[PDB]
């Protein structure tokens, strides 16, 4: 939209075109809260490695099998793909923690039972473009950094969402979480049409993996540049840019976790109360009610009829093996905590996720990457491990035979009576919103991002540094035609949220097994070098009743 | 809301605070009907066994295995749970037959093709509280029943639905179906957080069952009393109470059953008509149309393409084994009548249900409980027995090989093209409405209750009898501190329905295999002692076309 | 004021004169919150043991010395006093936890940085008076409990505060903390003028204790009854009573604890930063600034001048030994945590306090009393142990001699430059408000109760049960003249608070060493008998900056 920026007017060289606001404000009126998140980053930008659009495919990636030693079980290591590489760089606000710090997100999840996205707004200002000049040889080598005052920054935004939306925050290409650190960008690219099909049932014994088709699909290939698609704003030093307001159309995410399964949910089995300490209740044998099958005499609560069912079984860790190669079809998130005996054995089957991140995304070390693995421990109550289930021919007063009873079947149990939950907010490293795929059936829930954009997602902000060519422009030349140039500028954004107030639903005091536990707090705080970690908090934090 | 009651004003001792209306009215205007159901019960109430809230767990219940004799197949007998027991008693209107009698529900299903819930309203009036006084020893023992005129009845309603909704009518804790009989209440309780996880694939051969975690989860436990949650109305004899109007937001239930499968549904296979008696039509061999696979020559109606598919396969009688223990994941209701050969063999696999009930719920005997088992016989046309299905590699003009054809696979076949039905109304013993679980994905249908409340369910009416303490109040005392007290009062309620008129869609006369068959009618009518049975009628009664 | 009550009108026998509201509401608008606490109790009342006002003195109490074995150090065990005993009973709302439950007080201290008292209001309704009648002898003994409908309850309130205010909640005579349990009252009494003076420096070696004067002072004695002082309302069953609104004039209590001493407070000593991990900063030797004495060269931060001083020294555990006997002169509250090495050694010297309480005040056991001992661990930063301090003759560049340096002096260090804090809210067992003593110098702070009433305290609600005399009234008779009678009625009160919103002042996440720690949570929740504990929370909970 071009625009203004920050608080400054900024006309020409020597005037600032905007200010710095990283503050977050909470506004409580009645049942509702308004969270206004301001986020401001200082962005470093280099030249595009190439001024050309490039279409190429890749290798398989590390650990992919070169033989049948593991019989194709490690073909899940396939990173093969094909892409266009666009000279443009992407500014991605979409993560939690680009916006709120650990104390703000704690404020959010304690005071709000749910939250929704309202508005987004963005500016770019205080553009500084410099060229580097090297004068010397070995020792006399001296780099001079000169302001190029007439050099241009190129800015493109998609309000129309005509470019392939890829800014999902997977791979964590997003603005850093630490307000006082600089952000380098990464260069925009998207997938083209390719076939990658791996046959893992190949061979005589059907134990061998084989490549079927791996190629780029050139006759169907869609190449859309930035230049022929969106308006590109050209900006000098005294110039600033605003996106204009964006309005989210989304659905609220609930900030509590549900502990109830169908055995926790409805009317309780008639019970004789204990009259003494250490005594237990006794289930009444003769009762009336609804059982499932022809079953009558064992009035046990397991076979009580229910209206709905909480959770569903899945072929957990499903590998798809489609066109484009194997992917994972997630399954429902839940907690393996009810089944966990050995702390050394790590049960991943609750559709758990793993965050790999770095210094600017909340790792306390450079040169290395910290990990997390959120296994969703509070989300018990959907927990369904497919091998733990069973089915039997009939439900009656009679126990089935060995041949009428089946176990370890790995069936999809999602159906019309099932009630499930999504993951919710993973605070530091999780994405905020997502684009909806344009298909006849649009997905019901999201496996990661808590907010699904009903119309468009917020437009992708693409910046490029216009090339500074030398006196001699040769068609054969690439980066020898162009002067070495880099920019620094300032991104500011404002994201507004609307929460619903959380008030106590219980008599007893709310407990917490999360981060506020101390003695671990030497990290999460800067050290003598200024290095620190950002803690994980779930969006689903306090317990709540399902029904 | 406190309130009035019945038709009487009732100021003080000696004035009646309400009247008795158990009449049901039908109002026919045009295409629509209005059913106004009045229901009035005389309610007996005793002291709370304890004035304390209690949290405890239970035993497993009867028939649960103590060993591996049945290898864990009888772990489906688990009733283990954990609950709070609240001193309050629950008044539950939610059942059919608390409202309509057998002649009213016959009037409903014959004249209406569908019905929806409109309003609910409730009153409590004519409060009588008495204390018992025993004077004598063995023979001289004499019980005197004295009016305590200043004693209080406590009434709490949830309009906000802040208490755990458990009044689903499972276990048939509901107001009785016979207008002239008294109703004892049962004491309100709900589930707390507990883990019950049974590993049935345990052991070396994976044939043994093992307890993994069985406990109460105290750190997540939510304890919500009635006193800190809702307003409690205190009522003496000359006092009455009204709930205020409740408005249902629901979806109509269809009062007909569907006999069409996908073989009954669309265009008919081109056929040569018979010209004589005892002759049959002949399917035309050379026809044009859409088949499924590469199939061409066998133009058979089985492989005709369709737009949708009626019914879905399920791992029938799925045992979940989640946190909280095993439960059943229902599957779609349908009729095993097309597959039933032996009347002695009872095929339960259509998601059939079993009602166990007693004297006030429509059993003609006290001291024993009658049973029903509704196997949904008219609901043929969804009938899908998973072992009866198959799948094959290709569909072509060629019959597949033995290795290309699979049977007895127990797969969930629910998908985007499927059309299914819920059970509908089971008249005497079935619930009317249900609460929706609060989850990211809310269930599409209900496995039992025909009406799903979109906003809240009707609030739970909880009554308690305020304790009458003796002169000496000791903290160590429980029921020795309190005078033996009981109450009788009168519940009145009005439930309004809106039906759509059913008019004849066919030339031939509608037949009926249901209850109007006589010679069984000596029951269903009182006998010389006044004992009688209430008949079962389905909400889905007359046949109708699906498409 | 006489009045109405609850929600009911209640005219005559058979109408309820009020309802039950124990709910607490939070109202968030902008920077401010409004907490409306409703509290409703069911109160048991017996006859006054005597219808007479009695003036008497007592014994010394247990553990008081009968000899010089401990040389008078155990004369701190003196409970001797003199009182009038008034036939009236006291209803005391003044405690936290009569009002809020553990989840409400957690809501308060997390969302509010400070809170103040606004209004108080009280009602009494649903009066039930009964007489007991015993008929039989040994086995035939039978107690009949009859409603006496014309019997009276007597109610007196002081809006004028003309009676000796003694309802300070010390001794924990206050309405119970559990909404669903009954409350017995205790009979009102206050001190008269007496001399108790114990000389502990008596004897030749000044090691012996001696009684100087122990007596009642009859010539100065002030006897004020309830009857000649306040209006007494007489109430039957169909009657109710309201106090009218009371408005608090008080000062807000701050809900955070301060960790800063004078070494934590102002400008920081000039320091050379560490450039590596594991390295420490280095204090700069040559700096400029203000030191205290003639001191110049050691520019150390200990001798930096400050404007104020946080905390003061005290002759900790001062025993007063005045008229009326020994008492303790408290000293400032603070935390011994910085000095605590042995967990087995309990350092009491921070003006710590000890709560002894029972079943209705948050003990999980009857027949025994639980304890707490709040030692104020977060309140480090005032911590001043008098023997740990010192003083020296001069402050210079020279270290003083052995004779110029003093230790262990036990001096009061309170003065014009000192800044201190009070304790704040001890949630379950602490008092809310207090009366100010009427003296030329009124106290600055309070050693226990967080709120000091500037004008009057809320009036004392005194109830008595009017005596039911038998046919024969003899002047010699006491309790043989009167029929055995008891009452039960319902107290309702509404207390309103105005908090100031707490918003995050820090980047890092707030940690907590308090109660939300689980694994201790099996208590604090009811058990199979319904017994549970109430947790302690401080009013000063989160950290905050002093300056």
Author numbering:
A (entry chain E), B (entry chain Q), C (entry chain P): 23 to 569
Please quote the authors directly:
BuV1 is a member of the Protoparvovirus genus of the Parvoviridae family. Similar to all known parvoviruses, BuV1 assembles into a T = 1 icosahedral capsid. The gross capsid morphology includes pores at the 5-fold vertices, protrusions surrounding the 3-fold axes, a depression region at the 2-fold axes, and a wall separating the depressed regions near the 2- and 5-fold axes. The VPs have an eight-stranded β-barrel motif and an α-helix that form the core of the capsid, which is characteristic of all members of the Parvoviridae.
Subsequent 3D reconstruction yielded electron density maps at 2.84, 3.20, and 2.73 Å for pH 7.4, 4.0, and 2.6, respectively. At pH 2.6, the ordering of the N-terminus allowed for the assignment of 10 additional residues compared to either pH 7.4 or 4.0 structures. However, reasonable electron density allowed the fitting of this loop at pH 2.6. Indeed, in micrographs of the BuV1 capsid at pH 2.6, capsids were observed that appeared “broken” (red arrow). At pH 7.4 and 2.6, the rotamer is in an extended conformation, resulting in a pore with an approximate radius of 3.8 Å.
